[PDB]
Design an enzyme around this catalytic site. Structure first.
Site, short mmCIF file in Angstrom:
data_model
loop_
_atom_site.label_atom_id
_atom_site.label_comp_id
_atom_site.label_asym_id
_atom_site.label_seq_id
_atom_site.Cartn_x
_atom_site.Cartn_y
_atom_site.Cartn_z
N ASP A 1 49.53 36.43 25.51
CA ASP A 1 48.32 36.71 26.24
C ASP A 1 48.57 37.83 27.24
OD1 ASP A 1 45.70 35.91 27.64
OD2 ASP A 1 45.97 34.31 26.17
N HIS B 1 40.81 26.96 24.75
CA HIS B 1 41.11 26.04 25.85
C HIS B 1 39.96 25.94 26.85
CE1 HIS B 1 41.99 30.12 26.88
NE2 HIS B 1 42.00 29.82 28.17
N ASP B 2 38.92 26.76 26.66
CA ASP B 2 37.78 26.78 27.58
C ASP B 2 36.48 26.26 26.96
OD1 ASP B 2 39.11 27.88 29.79
OD2 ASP B 2 38.76 29.95 29.08
N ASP C 1 43.17 39.98 27.44
CA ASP C 1 42.24 39.12 28.15
C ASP C 1 41.16 39.94 28.85
OD1 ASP C 1 41.80 36.32 29.36
OD2 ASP C 1 42.08 37.53 31.18
N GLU D 1 39.80 40.19 23.68
CA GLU D 1 38.80 39.20 24.02
C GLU D 1 37.72 39.86 24.86
OE1 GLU D 1 39.15 34.94 26.04
OE2 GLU D 1 39.81 36.64 27.32
O1 PNG Z 1 41.25 30.32 35.92
N1 PNG Z 1 41.21 30.68 34.76
O2 PNG Z 1 42.16 30.41 33.91
C1 PNG Z 1 40.06 31.41 34.30
C2 PNG Z 1 39.85 32.69 34.78
C3 PNG Z 1 38.71 33.36 34.33
C4 PNG Z 1 37.84 32.78 33.38
O3 PNG Z 1 36.69 33.50 32.90
C5 PNG Z 1 36.92 34.60 32.03
O4 PNG Z 1 37.99 35.44 32.34
C6 PNG Z 1 39.24 35.13 31.84
C7 PNG Z 1 40.11 36.22 32.36
O5 PNG Z 1 41.10 35.70 33.17
C8 PNG Z 1 39.27 34.96 30.37
O6 PNG Z 1 40.49 34.34 30.09
C9 PNG Z 1 38.17 34.05 29.92
O7 PNG Z 1 38.07 34.16 28.55
C10 PNG Z 1 36.84 34.32 30.55
O8 PNG Z 1 35.99 33.25 30.39
C11 PNG Z 1 38.07 31.49 32.91
C12 PNG Z 1 39.20 30.80 33.38
#
Ligand code: PNG
Ligand code: MG
Length: 555
Positions: free
Chosen positions: A96, A323-324, A198, A249
């Site tokens: 990543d 994971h989200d 990312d 992404e």
């Molecule tokens: O705290 N976190 O792990 C976290 C941080 C940001 C987040 O929103 C977004 O930006 C991220 C970049 O960091 C991407 O990975 C993810 O695809 C996107 O949805 C979601 C979770």
């Protein structure tokens, strides 16, 4: 004919994959031990979510050192051994890459924040307060609130599109781009095979930093004016030097941009994820709101992305899960009575598209949302906060729990269920997040000993991609567009076709092949199916609940 075109990628979220130390957190050694399992599933790529040194304010996406591994996951020696053992089994490894922003605990930021005249100052994005006392723009953080955080000691705001301790890097600054490339070379020379990048499409900001009077400001940084320039430069400096795979992404992007991102002539990325198909059940784009998914819209989105990328020479990364997101059986399938059949159907529906498919850990077992029914079982700070707020607003407990069961980002983060032993064999200690009680029926050992398991259906889909070239080269043709239950399409090749028929619901329905489908002189054979009840004629038959069938047509 690059190796990534017919690859199947297994996405690992290491903290929930396999604990070998007893601390309740997955580790790199756990991944090594499971390589034979991954190979048995017939994946030939592994993708690790972030494992770098990080304060962990934001699940590892806030990195304080790109050159080292978060100690809990193991040592660099562990990692090098993972690379060696993976490669030995014909498995590639991608990492990543999180370079839109760093942790504010990163040494560059600590230096940069200290004074307007520090050597690293321009590594980040600094702006003055507006005379009216306002922040430099009205842009919103994707975490809510302003995207600018005031730093008192230096007297300026820094930009954070994400959380407060995730400071956006200044890609306008050549020194920054150079530093990032040097770091990428470090990892490639170590022998990794590529990167997922990312939110890479938000790195180019409008340098006029205007206010947005029509949104939260994303139109000034999403697929911005220099993104293709930066990606191509990244490709020239780094990717062109290795036998690599890159998947971007993209945050709320457009098809036309993704064609540009992925066309081999652009020399930018190999493929991209978009998230449009995973917003099909948001009512009014409300991410926490409950609703049924919009099937017709789902089919329209998938089809548009297939045909336009195919036409434009782009390449899609194909996925349902990360994971989200909620685990897909629970989200778009039926995790009740038809758990096995609907999980197989979903896998077929996406794997028979043109693109590189991704499987998220546990998806091959048909793991479900955990349905945690008490707040003490949850972990993600956004879930805990949402519970706290809804509670204060007077929402009954049961209604809040129902929301969390559908929407908590903890839901796909429960530990992979390996066997029927304590904590599903994920750990000898206490898992950092609980294992739901279904594990006794849903686990790898059980699936591996059942020839009709979801696992072996995925394995077969994976091998089919290596055996039948039409899966890669055939075009895509939607049929039965307006059908309320069926998702059916063709992949057209040279005197060869796939007809793919998927029931997305639990009722019986009629399939009839449209008159404009020309299959005169074609012989039909079943390529893969989730049900032994096969029609006498595919041209018109009653489709069973969650039935999925692929026909190979050859002339
Ligand atoms: O705290 N976190 O792990 C976290 C941080 C940001 C987040 O929103 C977004 O930006 C991220 C970049 O960091 C991407 O990975 C993810 O695809 C996107 O949805 C979601 C979770
Ligand atoms: Mg551990």
């Amino acid at each position: 004919n690059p190796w990534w075109k017919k690859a199947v990628v297994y996405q690992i979220y290491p903290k929930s994959f396999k604990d070998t130390t007893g601390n309740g957190v997955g580790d790199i050694r756990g991944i090594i031990e499971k390589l034979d399992y991954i190979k048995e599933l017939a994946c030939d790529v592994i993708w690790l979510t972030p494992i770098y040194q990080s304060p962990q304010n934001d699940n590892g996406y806030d990195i304080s050192d790109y050159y080292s591994i978060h100690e809990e996951y193991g040592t660099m020696a562990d990692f090098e051994e993972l690379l060696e053992e993976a490669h030995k089994r014909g498995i590639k490894v991608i990492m990543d890459l999180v370079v839109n922003h760093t942790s504010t605990e990163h040494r560059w930021f600590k230096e940069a924040a200290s004074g307007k005249e520090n050597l690293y100052r321009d590594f980040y994005i600094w702006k003055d307060m507006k005379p009216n006392g306002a922040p430099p723009t009205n842009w919103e953080s994707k975490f809510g609130g302003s995207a600018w955080e005031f730093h008192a000691e230096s007297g300026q705001y820094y930009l954070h599109l994400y959380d407060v301790t995730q400071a956006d890097l200044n890609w306008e600054n050549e020194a920054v781009r150079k530093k990032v490339y040097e770091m990428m070379h470090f990892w490639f020379e170590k022998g990794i095979d590529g990167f997922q990048l990312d939110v890479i499409n938000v790195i180019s900001k409008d340098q006029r930093f205007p206010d947005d009077d029509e949104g939260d400001g994303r139109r000034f940084y999403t697929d911005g004016p220099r993104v293709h320039e930066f990606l191509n430069e990244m490709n020239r400096e780094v990717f062109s030097k290795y036998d690599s795979m890159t998947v971007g992404e993209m945050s709320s992007t457009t098809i036309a941009d993704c064609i540009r991102y992925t066309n081999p002539e652009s020399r930018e990325l190999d493929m991209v994820f978009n998230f449009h198909h995973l917003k099909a059940d948001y009512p009014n784009g409300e991410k926490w709101a409950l609703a049924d998914f919009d099937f017709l819209k789902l089919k329209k989105i998938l089809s548009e992305w297939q045909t336009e990328m195919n036409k434009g020479g782009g390449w899609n990364a194909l996925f349902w899960c990360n994971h989200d997101q909620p685990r897909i059986v629970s989200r778009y399938g039926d995790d009740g009575k038809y758990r096995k059949k609907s999980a197989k159907m979903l896998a077929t529906a996406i794997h028979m598209l043109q693109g590189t498919p991704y499987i998220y850990q546990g998806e091959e077992l048909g793991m479900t949302n955990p349905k945690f029914d008490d707040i003490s079982l949850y972990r993600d700070v956004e879930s805990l906060n949402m519970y706290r707020i809804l509670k204060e607003a007077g929402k009954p407990e049961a209604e809040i729990i129902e929301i969390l069961k559908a929407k908590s980002r903890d839901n796909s983060r429960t530990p992979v269920q390996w066997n029927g032993e304590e904590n599903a064999g994920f750990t000898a200690g206490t898992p950092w997040i609980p294992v739901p009680d279904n594990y006794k029926e849903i686990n790898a050992e059980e699936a591996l000993n059942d020839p009709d398991s979801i696992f072996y259906h995925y394995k077969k889909l994976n091998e089919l991609r290596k055996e039948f070239d039409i899966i890669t080269t055939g075009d895509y043709q939607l049929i039965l567009e307006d059908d309320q239950e069926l998702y059916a399409y063709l992949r057209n090749g040279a005197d060869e076709k796939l007809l793919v028929i998927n029931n997305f619901y639990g009722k019986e329905t009629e399939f009839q092949l449209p008159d404009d489908i020309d299959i005169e002189g074609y012989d039909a054979k079943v390529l893969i199916s989730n049900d032994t009840d096969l029609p006498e004629s595919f041209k018109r038959f009653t489709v069973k609940p969650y039935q999925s069938i692929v026909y190979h047509l050859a002339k």
